[PDB]
Amino acid sequence: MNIFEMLRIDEGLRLKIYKDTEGYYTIGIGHLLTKSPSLNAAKSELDKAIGRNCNGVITKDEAEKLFNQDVDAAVRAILRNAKLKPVYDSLDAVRRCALINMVFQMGETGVAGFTNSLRMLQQKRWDEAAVNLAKSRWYNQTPNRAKRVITTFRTGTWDAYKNL
């Protein structure tokens, strides 16, 4: 298993503009288009992102290209962030995937806000961190996905996904 397969399981693949769990316009593999309520604003962002008139629909290839960009950008954000980098550097390969997943879902800023959990992960207090991570809006809003990520941090294995 790798970051791509992990995220593909968590986000799914949709080739037509759709609304995410938060009600925002998204396409492909969890590629947020706009927080704006206008489908028109979304279609515009889409065309800007792909470089063609898509009329709200894209191909598999296009979805995969956006996905490669998003994953790369998530990693780069962690490496540039003063709060995130040190944690990332301290983690093993599997756990590194769990942090990248959070950043992809919630943005750098959002993750950097989990101060206490970050400190516990850095200290390698797995059980404590899993308990702290669960006390968040994130966990309450998307519990099945949060549990998968949390189990990943907790165990350092891909068990939560070997099911799926």
From Swiss-Prot:
Changing T26H has the effect of: Facilitates transglycosylation more effectively than hydrolysis; covalently bound substrate
The UniProt keywords, alphabetically, are:
Antimicrobial, Bacteriolytic enzyme, Cytolysis, Glycosidase, Host cell lysis by virus, Host cytoplasm, Hydrolase, Viral release from host cell
Q: Where in the cell is it found?
A: Host cytoplasm
What result is annotated for mutating G30A? Almost complete loss of enzymatic activity
Q: What CDD domains does the annotation carry?
A: T4-like_lys
- Effect of mutating E11N: Loss of 84% of enzymatic activity
Mutagenesis or variant effect for D20C:
Nearly no effet on specific enzymatic activity
Cite the pH-dependence comment: Optimum pH is 7.3.
What does the entry say induces or represses the expression of this protein?
Answer: Expressed late in the viral replication.
Q: Which GO terms describe its molecular function?
A: lysozyme activity
Give the UniProt record's GO annotations in the biological process aspect.
cell wall macromolecule catabolic process; defense response to bacterium; peptidoglycan catabolic process; viral release from host cell by cytolysis
Q: Which reaction does it catalyse?
A: Hydrolysis of (1->4)-beta-linkages between N-acetylmuramic acid and N-acetyl-D-glucosamine residues in a peptidoglycan and between N-acetyl-D-glucosamine residues in chitodextrins
Q: What is its EC number?
A: 3.2.1.17
The record's InterPro entries line, in alphabetical order, gives: Endolysin_T4_type, Glyco_hydro_24, Lysozyme-like_dom_sf, Lysozyme_dom_sf, Phage_lysozyme-like, T4-type_lysozyme
Name the major location.
Answer: host cell
Indicate yes or no for the key word Metal-binding.
no
- Among the Pfam families in the record, one is Phage_lysozyme
Summarizing the annotation, the consequence of altering D20 to A/N/S/T is: Complete loss of enzymatic activity
Catalytic center at which residues?
Answer: E11, D20
Q: Where does substrate bind?
A: L32, F104, S117, N132
Family in the record? Belongs to the glycosyl hydrolase 24 family.
PANTHER family according to UniProt = T4-TYPE LYSOZYME 1-RELATED (PTHR37406:SF1)
Name the chain's protein.
Endolysin
Q: What is the lineage of its organism?
A: Viruses, Duplodnaviria, Heunggongvirae, Uroviricota, Caudoviricetes
UniProt lists the gene as E
